[PDB]
Design a protein around this ligand. Structure first.
Ligand SMILES: Nc1nc2c(ncn2[C@H]2C[C@H](O)[C@@H](COP(=O)(O)NP(=O)(O)OP(=O)(O)O)O2)c(=O)[nH]1
Ligand SMILES: [Mg+2]
Ligand SMILES: [Mg+2]
Length: 430
DNA sequence: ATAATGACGCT
DNA sequence: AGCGTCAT
């Protein structure tokens, strides 16, 4: 109608590093480049757990969380890089540092929200606005968009992928309304031009390739990112949403991958995101709550308002290690020693954070899991973090959890702990 | 024995 | 405060 908002107010990108840990190891070791390759944690149990996979290895069926011994059965030529181990635990510093390389480059173009170690959202709205004045209503050349797919195009009236890519791009650019500096489709297009530029800059300055989604919000941007991978970017326009959503499994949409997604499917008897449009906002709210219902009602029409938060730095700093199976910690001395290994890594990172980013954590969260409980955390307790000292932090953590030891003999520890987790939080400016 | 983290909602 | 969800 004449008053309906169409969720076309922003230009948002989601940039995701293609098999990131593998790229970091391949940059460092040229012998691993353009080879079936994976990154592995902990060599000893079944060759190690695989945590990142090159696209050459994926084609053999190698996946994350697969044991390396098992992936070698699928892919005998598979090359492996091992994650650094410090103080008896996986240490991800190399990938954190590579990540900062990428996020600093992206920060030159626009406002970014760090989403994970290898993903960031980009609010390109302002950047596009200014680019559109620089562009005298000039046509946008296909040459400015050499790795961009236009989702849903080509339509109607070739046999190779790049064939199809440029046909869709041509149909899109031929149709564009470049006189109108307010057309959402033009804005997205200009957004796509800037993300090409950002991705060229990242590759030139780090050697890392990545993929991107460009759309009007974060959920659509994230979804778009995954449509054409690797080293490609996808524009998802508002107009493309009805066809895209009509066969889009509900669980593919960000935040609908877990329990809420499954109950949407089971309570409503539907499979695809677009089927949600039949329901009133009140019906949706009555099944899933006021906030979830409102969000679904707007999302299945391609509309979502979660802002890109200007936050390039993590809000918590944490250290964690699982002790599965027979390795579960069963004695007081073990528990203490590992709390100390965690606290030491933590102090390193905290101190580094206090020098690099001018801030100071003030609360220490202590999380454990007990044997048999399959919840992530069996128990969470906090205490003050007054001093970046590894021995104080570990002793404090021991203190606030020790009474979970139900054992009679207190040389031993029951029930066995299957996880330790130290998280520094509640940062103050320093 | 699908890790090591991280952000946020509910009460 | 502490637990639950969702995610890479
Ligand atoms: N230990 C562990 N690390 C993981 C896992 N999954 C991801 N990581 C670590 C390692 C990853 O390199 C990195 C990024 O995660 P993604 O973006 O979800 N996948 P990637 O970047 O590998 O490939 P692409 O994006 O092209 O699909 O975070 C896992 O299951 N376990
Ligand atoms: Mg990635
Ligand atoms: Mg990612």
């Amino acid at each position: 109608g004449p008053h309906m908002a169409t969720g076309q107010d922003r230009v948002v990108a989601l940039v995701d590093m293609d098999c990131f840990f593998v790229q970091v190891e391949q940059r460092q070791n040229p012998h691993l480049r353009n080879k079936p390759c994976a990154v592995v944690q902990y060599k000893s149990w079944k060759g190690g757990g695989i945590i990142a996979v090159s696209y050459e290895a994926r084609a053999f069926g190698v996946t994350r969380s697969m044991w390396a011994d098992d992936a070698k059965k699928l892919c005998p030529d598979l090359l492996l890089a091992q994650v650094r181990e410090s103080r008896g635990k996986a240490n991800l510093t190399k990938y954190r540092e590579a990540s900062v390389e990428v996020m600093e480059i992206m920060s030159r173009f626009a406002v970014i929200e760090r989403a994970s170690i290898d993903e960031a959202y980009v609010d390109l709205t302002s950047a596009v606005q200014e680019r559109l004045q620089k562009l005298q209503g000039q046509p946008i050349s296909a040459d400015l968009l050499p790795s961009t797919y236009i989702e849903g195009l080509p339509q109607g009236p070739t046999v190779q992928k790049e064939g199809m890519r440029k046909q869709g791009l041509f149909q899109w650019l031929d149709s564009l309304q470049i006189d109108n500096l307010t057309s959402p489709d033009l804005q997205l297009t200009v957004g796509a031009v800037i993300v090409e530029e950002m991705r060229a800059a990242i590759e030139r300055e780090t050697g890392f390739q990545c993929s991107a989604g460009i759309s009007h919000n974060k959920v659509l941007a994230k979804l778009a990112c995954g449509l054409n991978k690797p080293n490609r970017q996808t524009l998802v326009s508002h107009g493309s949403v009805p066809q895209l959503f009509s066969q889009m499994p509900i669980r593919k949409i960000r935040s609908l991958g877990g329990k809420l997604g499954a109950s949407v499917i089971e309570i409503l008897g539907i499979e695809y995101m677009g089927e949600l449009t039949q329901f009133t906002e009140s019906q949706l709210q009555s099944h899933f709550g006021e906030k979830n219902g409102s969000w679904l009602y707007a999302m299945c029409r391609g509309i979502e308002h979660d802002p890109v938060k200007p936050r390039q730095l993590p809000k918590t700093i944490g250290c964690s290690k699982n002790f599965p199976g027979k390795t579960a910690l069963a004695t007081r001395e073990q528990v203490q020693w590992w709390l100390l290994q965690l606290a030491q890594e933590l102090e390193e990172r905290l101190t580094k954070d206090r020098n690099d980013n001018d801030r100071v954590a003030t609360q220490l969260v202590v999380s454990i899991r007990v044997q048999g409980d399959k919840r992530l955390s069996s128990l969470r307790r906090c205490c003050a973090l007054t001093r970046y000292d590894a021995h104080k932090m570990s002793h404090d953590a021991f203190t606030v959890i020790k009474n979970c030891n139900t054992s009679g003999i207190q040389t031993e520890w029951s029930p066995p702990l299957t996880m330790l987790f130290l998280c520094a939080t509640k940062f103050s400016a320093s």
